[PDB]
């Protein structure tokens, strides 16, 4: 029922580790499905091959942007921008996948894996899902973050796709 | 710039 979806990270080519999220449909459909539809790439457009432009160890990785690649681009499979679904999910702790936006009903494309526990976040960011596997390959990512971001290495969804 |  509720669609698991895994991101085969590579740090510079080098493949690191496979990370699976479980979406939350029951609750979060909309935002969901056009996550699982853009990990699979069935609409012609997706997350293979893009980057986790910003990643800030202790607080969040980011990436999403597949268009821009630095943090300004993205488009949902519903267009370029669809409106927050609800908050009825919070970020309660690391692996909680999360919509990045840029303020109310700006959603497209960019998500954030919370490495911590993010309160302040709640009520501004949708969540709709959850790291099922691999919490330590997304933990082992932080080490190429910074405070501010940047990230050293490249960091790359190098593939990924629909498990369940 | 969001999440802060």
Known sequence: VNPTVFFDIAVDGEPLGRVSFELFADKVPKTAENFRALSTGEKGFGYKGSCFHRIIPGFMCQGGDFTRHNGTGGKSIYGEKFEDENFILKHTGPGILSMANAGPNTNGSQFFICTAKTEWLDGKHVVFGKVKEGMNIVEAMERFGSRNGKTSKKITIADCGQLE | ?4
């Open chain 2, 1 to 4: 710039a969001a999440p802060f």
